[PDB]
Amino acid sequence: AKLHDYYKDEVVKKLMTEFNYNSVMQVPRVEKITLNMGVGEAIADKKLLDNAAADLAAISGQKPLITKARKSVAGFKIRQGYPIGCKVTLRGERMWEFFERLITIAVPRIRDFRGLSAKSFDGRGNYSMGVREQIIFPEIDYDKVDRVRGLDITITTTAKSDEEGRALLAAFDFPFR
Amino acid sequence: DKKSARIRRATRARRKLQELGATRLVVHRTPRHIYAQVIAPNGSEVLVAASTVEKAIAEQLKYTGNKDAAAAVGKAVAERALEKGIKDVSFDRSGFQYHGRVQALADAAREAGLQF
Amino acid sequence: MLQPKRTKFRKMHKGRNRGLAQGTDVSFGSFGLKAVGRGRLTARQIEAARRAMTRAVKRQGKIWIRVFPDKPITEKPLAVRMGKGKGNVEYWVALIQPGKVLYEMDGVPEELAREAFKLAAAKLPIKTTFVTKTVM
Amino acid sequence: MKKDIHPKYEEITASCSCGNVMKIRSTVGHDLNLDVCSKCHPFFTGKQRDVATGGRVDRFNKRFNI
Amino acid sequence: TRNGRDSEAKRLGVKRFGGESVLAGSIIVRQRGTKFHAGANVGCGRDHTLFAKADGKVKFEVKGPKNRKFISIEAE
Amino acid sequence: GIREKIKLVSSAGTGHFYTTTKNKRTKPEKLELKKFDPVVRQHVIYKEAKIK
RNA sequence: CCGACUUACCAACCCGAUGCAAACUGCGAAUACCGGAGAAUGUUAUCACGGGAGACACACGGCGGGUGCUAACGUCCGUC
RNA sequence: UCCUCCUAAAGAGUAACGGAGGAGCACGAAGGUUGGCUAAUCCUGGUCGGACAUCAGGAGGUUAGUGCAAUGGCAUAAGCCAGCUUGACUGCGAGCGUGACGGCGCGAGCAGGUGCGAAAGCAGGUCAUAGUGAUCCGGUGGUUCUGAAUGGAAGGGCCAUC
RNA sequence: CGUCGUAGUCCGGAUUGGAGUCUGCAACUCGACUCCAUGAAGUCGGAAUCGCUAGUAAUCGUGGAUCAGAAUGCCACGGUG
RNA sequence: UGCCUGGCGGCCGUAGCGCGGUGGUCCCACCUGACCCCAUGCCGAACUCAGAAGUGAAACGCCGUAGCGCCGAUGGUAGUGUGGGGUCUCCCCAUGCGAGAGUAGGGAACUGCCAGGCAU
RNA sequence: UUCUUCUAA
RNA sequence: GCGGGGUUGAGCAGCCUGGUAGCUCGUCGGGCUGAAAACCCGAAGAUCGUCGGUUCAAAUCCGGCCCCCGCAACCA
Ligand SMILES: [Mg+2]
Ligand SMILES: [Mg+2]
Ligand SMILES: [Mg+2]
Ligand SMILES: [Mg+2]
Ligand SMILES: [Mg+2]
Ligand SMILES: [Mg+2]
Ligand SMILES: [Mg+2]
Ligand SMILES: [Mg+2]
Ligand SMILES: [Mg+2]
Ligand SMILES: [Mg+2]
Ligand SMILES: [Mg+2]
Ligand SMILES: [Mg+2]
Ligand SMILES: [Mg+2]
Ligand SMILES: [Mg+2]
Ligand SMILES: [Mg+2]
Ligand SMILES: [Mg+2]
Ligand SMILES: [Mg+2]
Ligand SMILES: [Mg+2]
Ligand SMILES: [Mg+2]
Ligand SMILES: [Mg+2]
Ligand SMILES: [Mg+2]
Ligand SMILES: [Mg+2]
Ligand SMILES: [Mg+2]
Ligand SMILES: [Mg+2]
Ligand SMILES: [Mg+2]
Ligand SMILES: [Mg+2]
Ligand SMILES: [Mg+2]
Ligand SMILES: [Mg+2]
Ligand SMILES: [Mg+2]
Ligand SMILES: [Mg+2]
Ligand SMILES: [Mg+2]
Ligand SMILES: [Mg+2]
Ligand SMILES: [Mg+2]
Ligand SMILES: [Mg+2]
Ligand SMILES: [Mg+2]
Ligand SMILES: [Mg+2]
Ligand SMILES: [Mg+2]
Ligand SMILES: [Zn+2]
């Protein structure tokens, strides 16, 4: 809750000035962070899912919700009901502490990190990014793992416009460009 | 949203008591207050009512939206109902969980003398 | 030859053809060929009368066809007895009531439209007439 | 949160080569030694240099004089 | 050919109309769905059959926000 | 018609039995239900036996 | 690799205008049918029970239709 | 043979070697109850990831869903999850529906015993309508009802069932 | 003597980028060489097939002719054997 | 009694959307916190509990507004019961019934019971 | 064990 | 009118209760031969007749069609 403490005193004072909001409730705020691993190759065996869910449980310290197919499609050879991915929703204090560890540790540990995109805000403020490799988090031991996974991070916020979420992450020095 | 989904969650048992002809006690729960009223089987008029918005009940309480306040409402609405001669009702939970402040009201109303 | 691409059903009852029509006013173009009689126009009769008016204007102007043959018509083959199922769909008609505008036309003078629709009406079984776009 | 299903989530210390001592809550357990943090990553100085297009005329004039 | 089949007519419809006094248990409407709905003193059967739970006159009426048709037995 | 039919013999000592069907391919384990026994006038566990 | 552009080429959705439907309906009659009340009228015309049957090859005409070719002194139903 | 729609003429019914489709099952949960939930599609953003998996937002508002044909239903959901369970109870049944009949159907309530629910209540299988076979003869279990002088027994009856 | 310790490796060196040297009026097509980086295929080769009887095969370097520059070819030479 | 709000109905779009405006003493909403009651096929999001620092941003309520949705005559037209007629695949006459669509227009609901707040 | 055929002057 | 069939270049399996394309010969590339055969090695290829539907998905299931092969078209 270090950044949550950092949110409540200086980010709110910053955004109220540069947007001239009438109320303090009118400010944006982050709401949840969703950690998906679409593991489409787990239809061969459960153990790839069972270890990828084990890896994402180490990144964010929650047991992941194993997601399933909403319907059946034949291009991917899946039926409605097959376990096909895993997610973690992060809210409250656990949202901020992962968000602290993300932009301070794991984003510098990206190989050939050169910035993010400012064109990834889904028209309505909600930001989504995808990492290539789970080794950028220091939770994963390099010798103990064998397979390079990938996950994607989705920050869902209360910003109405598209730029207001872009200004919100910039108050947390989110490395756009 | 939350207000609308609560009504859909409540509107099955309300229609079931509507055809049973049951004089029915309605609890309503807010984060600050809790409400109770006994409604006639035509559904258009009430018989007795009690709340933590009334001065005579809230001043005897610490906070209006805890279980002790919720037990004080269910005790008060039952003593007003038995004064008017209403004894057998049917508890309408009104889309809340039968739990906590809702349960503490109904346990108070059973104990104070209402029959459901 | 006009024909529906898909149909919900392959065959249809014979029905009746009583009542007045609905496509009465000249909607799109300026001059119109209005049906006065009653009957059915086949897909051959519609397409033959279109050719007879397209050549009379030397493809000048624009021709609408207000009707469309969507009713399937069955026939039994020769030397087949009256039982044993409904006959095979042979051709397509459009049921025409009195008052139906059959064709429309503009981009041509009035006298050219009279002589074009007269050449077209000689290919149609029903009695027709000439109409113009009425204000209101 | 539920009681048993979650992994152990304990506050540890992560230090870096620039000496940025930072205490975070984590699932590592043992202490952590980092390499680059967001304070010392060359995103704000180093990545600007790393484009390095270079001039073709400037390469030509450097190699001699007329 | 291929079209010789049909099923027996299940004889649905409304057996007692409005303003028509019935005994308790009398079938009012037989129907597939709930094309009609059960109002006061009217039960809905297993196959959505509407029967009278009491004695009295049949009252057809349209209530509710969806304008559904309810059948009730008035007292008599 | 793979769904064969069985009988549920009362365990109350009476020879009373309910009869029913089951898919013996997909449910190899025996069916046991607690049903009313009209001879003893109690609810007694019935067990699956062969229809014979 | 990105494409560049234009072209007597087609075109979803959407929008406006316009038709069609036995197995389309956000509409919807006349009649018919069911129930109630009330006169007038009718040789109880009504129902129940019992004795005896015959008949179950129909025809044409009107209307509403299927089928056929809106062919048949054709065929198959409803109704008179 | 059975189910659904049209023909069928706005109650029911209504024929043809008329127009179109299905059924001869499935389910010990896909039943009961309590609690909760709400689709299809498209748009944008996002590691592998692509027309199409999963994730996050938005439009949309049932164009989805229903074990299966069609039709009528379905948001209080009958659609979809989970908990506990066996009412897929036995004896009855006022009163109606439907048939020439055999028969078929709907049914509040009552007695017993039960499940779920705090309780009001709900449950006598499933959204409904297909998934079926009379009688005879014979088998099995139950039942002293019968038992050809008498006591048994055989056989028969009744109940369940094949 | 030390080192690697069975791996696509400290094996293998292709390919390619950058920087050069030299020859030559002139190295773009189209030279050789060097440096830094890069690190393909290849883990002993199907049917088939070649050479060789002693300083031979096998292997290891050396030189010359041609030639401004430009050989893994050719012609010679010895080592181990 | 007025105003405002909450609850439960009546009624079921003249009652719904949209657009603009506006409300926080109370009420309501978001909200604060969560070891517990309780909860997440992960997550105090929801559900629940303990509360009251903040705000009416959202939601909700209220006010305005004809972009819609909706309502909707009158007249005519279609159909049609009975009787009659013709040129009889379809129409006409007498009489009775009389649409739908469209037009004029309406239209930003109405109302009951109880409770609370502020006024009178 | 089987094991064929080859034009032009 | 009723049955059966339509699958690499050719001839035929697999078509089976829907997730999965085979053989032979031919063809290509080598090898052997003075050379061509035969032989030896290594190869590859199918929108499963068409057109609709069912499905998550059709060579497959269903319907319609086309082509071909059968059978029957009788009684006066
Ligand atoms: Mg007609
Ligand atoms: Mg119709
Ligand atoms: Mg007979
Ligand atoms: Mg007869
Ligand atoms: Mg006859
Ligand atoms: Mg007859
Ligand atoms: Mg006729
Ligand atoms: Mg006829
Ligand atoms: Mg005749
Ligand atoms: Mg005739
Ligand atoms: Mg007749
Ligand atoms: Mg009818
Ligand atoms: Mg009728
Ligand atoms: Mg079900
Ligand atoms: Mg429920
Ligand atoms: Mg169910
Ligand atoms: Mg069903
Ligand atoms: Mg016999
Ligand atoms: Mg004896
Ligand atoms: Mg005896
Ligand atoms: Mg004897
Ligand atoms: Mg060595
Ligand atoms: Mg090397
Ligand atoms: Mg390799
Ligand atoms: Mg090796
Ligand atoms: Mg020799
Ligand atoms: Mg040289
Ligand atoms: Mg607004
Ligand atoms: Mg909360
Ligand atoms: Mg506001
Ligand atoms: Mg009028
Ligand atoms: Mg009107
Ligand atoms: Mg309005
Ligand atoms: Mg408004
Ligand atoms: Mg020869
Ligand atoms: Mg050869
Ligand atoms: Mg296939
Ligand atoms: Zn650092």
> CA of B92 vs C1' of J119, distance in Å?
36
* Residues B29 and B95 sit within 8 Å (Cβ to Cβ): no
Report CA(C19)–ligand 31 centroid distance (Å). Answer: 20
Q: What are the Cα distances from residue E38, in Å, to B71, E15, E25, E46? A: 38, 15, 13, 13
Output the CA angle F32-F37-F40, nearest 5 degrees: 130
**Is nucleic acid strand J under 7 Å from B2's C-beta?**
yes
Identity (one letter) of the amino acid at F45? I
Closest Cα in chain D, distance from residue A117 (Å)? 14
In sequence order, the 6+-apart residues with CB closer than 8 A to the CB of B32 are: B64, B65
**CB of C123 closer than 8 Å to CB of C32:** no
HSE (CB half, 13 Å, CA atoms) of A26? 9
Q: Tell me if C35 is assigned to some domain.
A: yes
Physical contact, A and D (3 or more Cβ pairs within 8 A) = yes
- Does E1 map to a domain? no
- The amino acid that residue E14 corresponds to is V
Q: To the nearest whole angstrom, how far is the Cα of E3 from the nearest Cα of chain C?
A: 9
Taking each helix axis from N to C end, the angle separating C110-121 and C43-54, rounded to the nearest 10 degrees, works out to 150
Longest dimension (CA), chain B: 40
Query: What does residue A75 show for φ and ψ, rounded to 5 degrees?
Result: -65, -25
CATH number assigned to the domain comprising residue A99: 3.30.1440.10
How many Å apart are A130 CA and H45 C1'? 11
- What's E48's domain CATH number? 2.40.50.100
Ligand 26 centre from E32 Cα, in Å? 109
Q: How far is the CA of B1 from the centre of ligand 34 (A)?
A: 19
Report resolution (Å) to 1 decimal: 2.9
Let me know: does C102 contact C131? Beta carbons within 8 Å.
no
Q: Which nucleotides of I are covered by protein (CB under 7 A)?
A: 19-20
Residue E38 lies in a domain: yes
Nearest to D9 by CA among A109, A92, A32, A59: A59
Domain that holds residue A140: 1-177
User: Mutating which of D20, D24, D30 best tests the A interface, going by the most A Cβ atoms within 10 A?
Assistant: D24
Find residues whose C-beta atom lies within 7 angstroms of strand L.
A 71-74, 77, 79; E 2
Strands, sheet with B90-92, edge to edge from the N-terminal-most edge strand: B46-51, B34-39, B24-29, B90-92
> How many residues make up chain F in this entry?
52
Q: How far apart are CA C29 and CA C35, in angstroms?
A: 16
Query: Interior CA angle at D37 toward D36 and D38, to 5°?
Result: 130
CATH number at residue C85: 3.90.1170.10
Q: How far is CA C109 from CA C31, C106, D14, in A?
A: 9, 8, 91
Residue carrying structure tokens 């909607």 = C27
First to last CA, chain C: 34
Is A139 within 8 Å of D33 (Cβ atoms)?
Answer: no
Contacting subunits of E (3+ beta carbon pairs below 8 A)? C
- Inter-chain residue contact A97 with D38, CB threshold 8 Å: no
Q: How many CB atoms lie within 10 A of CB C1?
A: 11
Domain carrying residue B18: 1-116
Strand J: which residues 4-33 of A lie within 7 A (CB)?
Answer: 22-26, 32
Number of domains in chain A: 1
Residue E8 lies in a domain: no
- CA of A161 from ligand 34 middle (Å) equals 26
Q: Is C110 exposed, middle or buried (0-12, 13-18, 19+ CB in 10 A)?
A: exposed
Provide the CA A12 to C1' L39 distance, Å, integer.
89
The CATH number covering residue B5 comes to 3.30.420.100
- C81 assigned to some structural domain: yes
User: What burial letters (b/e) apply to C31-59, b meaning 16+ CB within 10 Å?
Assistant: bbbbbeebbbbbbebbbebbebbeebbee
Q: Is the CB of A92 under 7 A from strand J?
A: yes
Residue of chain C nearest E3, judged by CA positions: C85
The structure's method of determination equals cryo-EM
Please check whether residue E34 is in contact with residue E69, taking contact to mean a CB–CB distance below 8 angstroms. Answer: no
Q: Which residues of E touch C81 (CB under 8 A)?
A: none
Q: Alpha carbon of F29 to those of C9, F22, F25, F32, F37: distances in Å?
A: 51, 11, 10, 9, 23
- Compute the CA torsion angle C121, C122, C128, C133 (nearest 10 deg): 20
Separation between Cα atoms, residue E33 and residue E69, nearest integer Å:
12
Q: Do D14 and A103 touch (CB under 8 A)?
A: no
CA distance A148 to chain D (A): 19
D7/A58 Cβ within 8 A:
yes
- Interface membership of C84 toward E (CB under 8 Å): yes
C46: domain range?
A: 21-136
Three-state DSSP class for residue A121: coil
- Taking the C-alpha atoms of residue B67 and residue B107, their distance in angstroms, rounded to an integer, is 11
Give the number of domains in chain E: 1
Give the distance (Å) from ligand 18 centre to CA of residue B60.
89
E-chain CB neighbours of C74 within 8 Å are none
User: Cβ(C16)–Cβ(C83) under 8 Å?
Assistant: no
Does D37 reach chain A within 8 Å, measured CB to CB?
Answer: yes
Q: Report the separation in Å between the CA atom of C109 and the middle of ligand 26, taken as the mean of its atom positions.
A: 113
Give the residue with minimal CA–C1' separation from H96. E26
The closest CB to that of A113, out of D24, D37, D43, belongs to D43
Give the CA dihedral A87, A93, A97, A103, nearest 10 degrees. 80
Beta bridge partner(s), residue E62: E69
Q: Is residue E4 part of a domain?
A: no
Where do we find the tokens 């209530």?
Answer: E63
Q: How far is the CA of C42 from the C1' of L1 (A)?
A: 31
Of C26, C53, C37, C48, which is closest to residue C131 (Cα–Cα)? C26
Length of chain B: 116
Nearest partner of A33 among A91, A85, A84, A75, judged by Cα: A91
How many residues appear in chain A? Answer: 177
Nearest nucleotide (C1') to the CA of residue A68?
H54
- Coil, strand or helix at E74: strand
Domain count of the fold of chain B: 1
Q: What pairing do the DSSP bridges indicate for beta strands C39-42 and C88-96?
A: antiparallel
Angstrom distance, F28 CA to L18 C1': 28
Contact (CB<8Å) A138/D32: yes
| Residue C67: HSE in the Cβ half-sphere, 13 Å Cα cutoff | 32
DSSP E strands in C19-106: the ranges are 31-35, 39-42, 62-65, 71-75, 88-96, 101-106
Look at the alpha carbons of F26, F30, F35, F37 in this order and tell me if their dihedral is positive or negative: positive
- Residue C13 covered by a domain: no
Which among A63, A105, A173 is the nearest to D37, CB-wise? A105
Structural domain contains residue E2? no
